[PDB]
């Protein structure tokens, strides 16, 4: 009998092809994401700065009334 190493009935298929997911996000919408986060931060920043100006004028009134 003969006992070499053949392919056992023909092997299954072998992949070789390239693949890229191209993800993605449709980058103009990603610019919209960035500009939205930017303007979100500016809105909250504006609110906090004006409330802190209010409190800083209160500390001004403290130093004014305490002074004489």
């Amino acid at each position: 009998v003969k006992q070499d190493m053949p392919p056992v009935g023909g092997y299954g298929p072998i992949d070789y092809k390239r693949n890229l997911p191209r993800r993605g996000l449709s980058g103009y919408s990603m610019f919209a994401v960035g500009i939205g986060a930017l303007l979100f931060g500016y809105w909250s920043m504006m609110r906090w700065n004006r409330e802190r100006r209010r409190l800083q004028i209160e500390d001004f009134e403290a130093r004014i009334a305490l002074m004489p």
Partner: protein, 54 residues
């Protein structure tokens, strides 16, 4: 099977890179006159012009 997947992940890593492409595009011009007179062999001849394979 394993190696086809790993080399496609190497294409995922390196080929679509910004600064690696910027690192090797500008250099290494090879004119076909130079490729055939200066005795170049193999991958230079494939990568620069002439259709050639032993």
């Amino acid at each position: 099977k394993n190696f086809s997947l790993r080399i496609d992940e190497l294409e995922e890593m390196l080929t679509n890179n910004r600064i690696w492409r910027n690192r090797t595009v500008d250099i290494g011009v090879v004119t076909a006159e130079d490729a055939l007179n200066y005795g170049f062999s193999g991958v230079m001849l494939r990568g620069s012009g002439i259709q050639w394979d032993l």
